[PDB]
């Protein structure tokens, strides 16, 4: 209602006034970012500073100590642990966690030289920061919030982020403010939704080059992103989990098999190493990597990584958070504290350490020379030249596009759900009305997918998420402030 | 009395003994300087080292959470707050927060070369250092001491440093060790208040060639200070403060809506990331710079700054803790603790990141390459010129002249008061003997100031200081021994 | 019995089969080592950080405040921490205490210029890693481990590391298990026995070419270690502690006033800037030698050091901790952690950074530029020059001599004895068989000993300790897993 349409067309507008302008499109979508960024980077590092600070509060303060709801845990602990490990279903993490280590290496933060041994001593830590408990600790506040209003305070959040922000709310969110909130959030939310999208194409894409070698051109990018929509809307069209059940249980069931391959290949005893080592920088340098800014030197660095990947984290706060408030009914404050940051940071760290040392030693041992001049052909290309360079280069590379498909194909469906909901009569689930809804959002997200595809950068799908993030930081603020002033007077049994 | 007169011959000897002979006294205070620095420093570190741990114990340990006092607090939690980061008073801070990032990144610490993007890296993180949270801390002890002495242990401290000695006195404090400690204490205060004076005059003075160009000259210096002491003799002659009280407030005023000026004007966007960054840097650095010392390389820098800076806050140090103390009647430890620190830092920081950031950039792009090339005619000089160099370059070194010319005369004034109280009859306050001794004091803080102007090194002040803590880091030490014993058994209802 | 030939035939076969081979064994000693050290010295780090956060919670958490025992505390506080800052008794100690800065600034860690200014910078900052509180709290755990074995679960340890594994130990520890690890066990700590012996000895000898000038060849490092053993053999002979008693109360008299003296004249001042400077430097690099490993560089360092001396600590650990626990009666969970850091640490650090400065001093200032050259004959050579280059260069190094002696002819006997209780009846102490058996390990420790000089490297004593502490990680994780699953349900009075 006053939350679908507005949506709709302020991403029409941008769409085909998009689609008219490449070359204009491209020069917009680059001032904005290098305004948001340069201008206001620094919000994002105190956002996420105070919400680590946040952390400390939620697990040695107040409310810490105190039963999140009623008696029973829904869970058992380890299956509530995993249940996190295995969360993870995003093929962009694929991407990042491929070429990230590469870009830290070949432009490093901190006036080291270019490709130089000290460059790459830094790499899989600035993942390790950019990946690991900081970020994930940011989450436990947004976390205990939405798990609170869901079992000591009854109020079931109906799926958009106003319906919470009325204990704050000096101009009723029930009206307008709620509601130009709750659009503002879901844009960003649906271009972020397109920016997983137009990654997580290219790879299966490129990785079909590797199957007697169907071509990538922009259109079959095209082709195969309404491949998915079609083949998701003709698995809404009837009812039955014989597929899509297990087809999580599998993307799962592959990816740690896969990351395992990579692993003991890669050599066991040399990323025991630089883990070790890794871990060791990164708490060194974890005060200048948060507070890493604009030097006086002006390199773009942290503006160019750590300020996006925050927007990034911005914008899928709340969204995670309801998700692990969902599966936390029996835990303690400070449990879900620590579980989440373990079980998620175990999850995360072990990928990057792992797809990004076996991208470092190909880049160091002349083995593909290539990242640097793969480039003249596609980011994506390099990435899969990174899976291609491993033993038994065909089990992998099958093992890679078919871990790399039914991981965007669960994407597409969960976050079409997520996006119908959000736009839904308050009672049940999936009811009546909840069918063209979610089909519909489906073709929404992967036209995103394209348009950012055909303007081609990197930037424009970093603006995306840069600019998505900048109202969400506000919102964010906003559902945890409503959730302190609650509480405050409304616990201490 | 006993620390009347002892005070008065020993600067006096000091004075015409140096007024003899300038080329003879310039080598003399130059060799004590690189005597007690070099040998002596790292007991200035660790001294702040101990009192940092101090802050930790007074805050987690047994007096916390314990109300320092009975129940009622005299100002509000606000006002409180406020009435710290208010209570600058001194122009010598306006001098340190505009050369200061200067000094820094022409002379580097951690052999960093001169100039270089590095050194401006580090040149706010530096000041942030020596005027942030750490120093600030080191005052919670004899702050929660000086206050503990006064609200649960009814014992009303005279001025004197002495009579508060005898819990640990083992020769009777009220005897001669209390006596050549009071007065030890004293002549060191005397020359700090004669250090800020000639540091506050050579700022007003040059400010003055600015308003028709009244020349700077030595002698003119000279008359304006002296211009001062009877312009705050006049100021004592008859009772009412229609004037001396909103003086404060004005000077208050007056330094916000400067810095508030300084900032905006200077760019922002810019200092919030360079603000950013630096945190990030002291962060990571302050290990470092605590226990910075004479390295084996022998550079001179926290020799020359942390060193003599440290002196400094070690002088000012019970002062400004019955300060802090008079105006905390309700507060817990913890409160205390935290509020003082909160507070003073607030002020504290935005000052010297605010002139700093604004001296960094005139330094960076070339726009005034002068203090380089103006020290061959004053640093107070290019100062000033950091002023000058700013928009409606009129408006502001006018509000630079006032608020650092009513600074230093309300400087003036309560610190002969201050000097004046700790040699007086007991009972209530400037009652009938209080008269021609705060004038006099007045005359003898300002002679002193000259004195220093007449050597017109840096170091003459420097040393000054120096010489001045050496003592009173004893003193300090023991005024918090003395108070822990007593506490120790003389608590726990 | 089941661990007494064990050992025997293990050393033996390895002896006059290195013995047959000394070209051929420093070949596999040297393979071994770059083995060990390159693929698992990640292990030797994690180790000790985990060990590192046990001091934590068993600081902070359930058995903190629980009294370790008994009411009564055999020893007064003081006599207590002392007893710890006295325990030293070993001169391999004075070995590397004397060369380590010097390997430190001739080959640094992270890429820095060998000697230059940096380099000398981190010098003593890594020995106070190496030997400060960190490895000193690694033993935090195995102390209130031992202790609880012993006071509260009145459960008295006989001698042998089995006899504690029961409480975890599946496949009950009186058995093979057991045993398998006890003999595991006694060789790598004969090994280390040998290790300290096989360089006390060199230190004494080349001591003895400064007193008319005995030489130095291995037959006379041979001779003195059998003269060690007689010596030590007609000292168990009779019943009287009129000699022994007062050796250790000598060898401490001593090693603190030869510490006193290198102290002072070294000059004063300048140690206690380069230990300040050098604190500050550890804190700062703290987590990153932690977590140092295997640059991509592969320099060698940790590898070199860390993981060698880490190794070494493992050996030494609940020996180490049953002696801590032995003489640690009446005191809390917490004032153990306390107390052992505070005294080791304080010895520790004293002697490192003394002898440690005394040579930089010597390298630094052109005065013996001989340990780069005079390595062309002996390290321990370098070592006494290092004692000779000082003012009464004959007192010294006669008391470097004497000191250097009954050190290890104290070391001898102490852990001959700690041998032999490790295979004998449990009723008693050193009753009717032990005698031949405690002057029979002795023989065997010193003739490791030579064993090693005969291969003269650093590597053979390096990988001597290594490959001991290999094992022995294992065996402590699990003398510390068995004492907290016990512990855990059998205490909350
Ligand atoms: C990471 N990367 C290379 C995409 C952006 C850079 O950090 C910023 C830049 O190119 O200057
Ligand atoms: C999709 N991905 C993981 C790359 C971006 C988001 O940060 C995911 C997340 O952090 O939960
Ligand atoms: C990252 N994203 C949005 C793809 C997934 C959600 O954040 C978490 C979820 O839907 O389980
Ligand atoms: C995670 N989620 C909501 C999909 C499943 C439920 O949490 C499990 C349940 O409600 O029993
Ligand atoms: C800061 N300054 C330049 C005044 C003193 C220096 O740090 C010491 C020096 O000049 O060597
Ligand atoms: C006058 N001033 C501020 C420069 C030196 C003292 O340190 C002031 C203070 O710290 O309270
Ligand atoms: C710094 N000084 C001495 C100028 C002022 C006092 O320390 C504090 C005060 O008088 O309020
Ligand atoms: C701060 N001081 C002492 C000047 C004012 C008083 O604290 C206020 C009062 O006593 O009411
Ligand atoms: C310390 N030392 C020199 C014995 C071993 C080195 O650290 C390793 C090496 O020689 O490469
Ligand atoms: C003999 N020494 C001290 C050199 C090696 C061991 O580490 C000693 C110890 O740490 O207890
Ligand atoms: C280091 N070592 C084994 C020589 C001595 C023991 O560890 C401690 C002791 O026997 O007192
Ligand atoms: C340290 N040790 C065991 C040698 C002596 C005893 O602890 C002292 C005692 O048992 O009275
Ligand atoms: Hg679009
Ligand atoms: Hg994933
Ligand atoms: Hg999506
Ligand atoms: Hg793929
Ligand atoms: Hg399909
Ligand atoms: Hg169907
Ligand atoms: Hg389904
Ligand atoms: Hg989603
Ligand atoms: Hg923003
Ligand atoms: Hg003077
Ligand atoms: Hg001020
Ligand atoms: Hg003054
Ligand atoms: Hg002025
Ligand atoms: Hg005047
Ligand atoms: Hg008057
Ligand atoms: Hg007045
Ligand atoms: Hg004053
Ligand atoms: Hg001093
Ligand atoms: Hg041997
Ligand atoms: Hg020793
Ligand atoms: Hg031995
Ligand atoms: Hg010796
Ligand atoms: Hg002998
Ligand atoms: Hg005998
Ligand atoms: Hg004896
Ligand atoms: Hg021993
Ligand atoms: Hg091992």
């Given at each position: 209602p006053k939350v679908f349409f507005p949506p709709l067309i302020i991403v029409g507008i941008l769409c085909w006034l998009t689609v008219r302008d490449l070359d204009a499109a491209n020069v917009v979508i680059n001032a904005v970012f290098s305004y948001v960024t340069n201008v206001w980077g620094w919000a994002f590092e105190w956002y996420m500073v105070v919400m680590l600070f946040g952390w400390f509060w939620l697990v040695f303060?107040?409310?810490?100590?105190?039963?999140?709801?009623?008696?029973?845990?829904?869970?058992?602990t380890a299956s509530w642990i995993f249940?996190?490990?295995?969360?993870?279903?995003?093929?962009?993490?694929?991407?990042?966690?491929?070429?990230?280590?590469?870009?830290?290496?070949?432009?490093?933060?901190?006036?080291?030289?270019?490709?130089?041994?000290?460059?790459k001593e830094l790499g899989l830590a600035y993942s390790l920061f950019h990946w690991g408990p900081l970020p994930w600790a940011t989450y436990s506040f947004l976390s205990v919030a939405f798990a609170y209003f869901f079992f000591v305070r009854k109020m079931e959040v109906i799926r958009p982020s106003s319906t919470l922000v009325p204990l704050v709310g000096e101009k009723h969110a029930k009206?307008?403010?709620?509601?130009?909130?709750?659009?503002?959030?879901?844009?960003?939310?649906?271009?972020?939704?397109?920016?997983?999208?137009?990654?997580?194409?290219?790879?299966?894409?490129?990785?079909?080059?590797?199957?007697?070698?169907?071509?990538?051109?922009?259109?079959?990018?095209?082709?195969?992103?309404?491949?998915?929509?079609?083949?998701?809307?003709?698995?809404?069209?009837?009812?039955?989990?014989?597929?899509?059940?297990?087809?999580?249980?599998?993307?799962?069931?592959?990816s740690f098999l896969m990351l395992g391959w990579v692993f003991i290949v890669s050599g066991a005893s040399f990323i025991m190493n630089y883990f070790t080592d890794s871990v060791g920088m990164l708490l060194m340098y974890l005060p200048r990597m948060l507070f890493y800014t604009d030097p006086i030197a002006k390199g773009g660095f942290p503006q160019g990584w750590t300020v996006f990947y925050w927007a990034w984290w911005v914008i899928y706060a709340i969204q995670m958070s309801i998700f692990l408030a969902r599966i936390?009914?029996?835990?303690?404050?400070?449990?879900?504290?620590?579980g989440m940051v373990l079980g998620l940071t175990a999850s995360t760290w072990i990928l990057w350490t792992v797809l990004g040392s076996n991208t470092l030693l190909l880049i160091d041992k002349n083995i593909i020379n290539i990242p640097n001049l793969i480039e003249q052909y596609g980011v994506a290309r390099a990435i899969i030249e990174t899976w291609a360079a491993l033993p038994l280069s065909t089990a992998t590379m099958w093992g890679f596009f078919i871990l790399c498909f039914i991981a965007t194909v669960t994407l597409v469906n969960a976050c079409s759900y997520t996006l119908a909901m959000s736009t839904c009569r308050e009672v049940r689930d999936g009811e009546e009305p909840p069918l063209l809804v979610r089909i519909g959002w489906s073709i929404l997200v992967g036209?995103?997918?394209?348009?950012?595809?055909?303007?081609?950068?990197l930037k424009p799908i970093?603006?995306?998420?840069?600019?998505?993030?900048?109202?969400?930081?506000?919102?964010?603020?906003?559902?945890?402030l409503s959730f302190i002033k609650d509480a405050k007077q409304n616990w201490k049994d």
């Open positions: 303060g107040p409310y810490a100590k105190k039963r999140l709801g009623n008696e029973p845990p829904e869970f058992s249940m996190m490990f295995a969360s993870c279903t995003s093929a962009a993490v694929l991407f990042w966690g491929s070429i990230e280590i590469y870009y830290y290496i070949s432009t490093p933060p901190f006036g080291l030289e270019p490709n130089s041994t000290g460059a009206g307008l403010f709620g509601t130009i909130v709750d659009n503002f959030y879901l844009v960003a939310l649906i271009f972020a939704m397109g920016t997983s999208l137009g990654l997580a194409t290219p790879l299966v894409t490129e990785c079909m080059q590797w199957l007697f070698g169907i071509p990538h051109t922009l259109q079959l990018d095209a082709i195969i992103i309404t491949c998915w929509i079609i083949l998701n809307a003709i698995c809404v069209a009837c009812g039955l989990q014989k597929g899509v059940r297990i087809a999580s249980d599998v993307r799962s069931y592959l936390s009914r029996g835990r303690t404050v400070r449990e879900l504290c620590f036209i995103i997918g394209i348009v950012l595809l055909a303007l081609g950068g970093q603006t995306a998420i840069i600019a998505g993030g900048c109202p969400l930081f506000f919102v964010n603020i906003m559902v945890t």
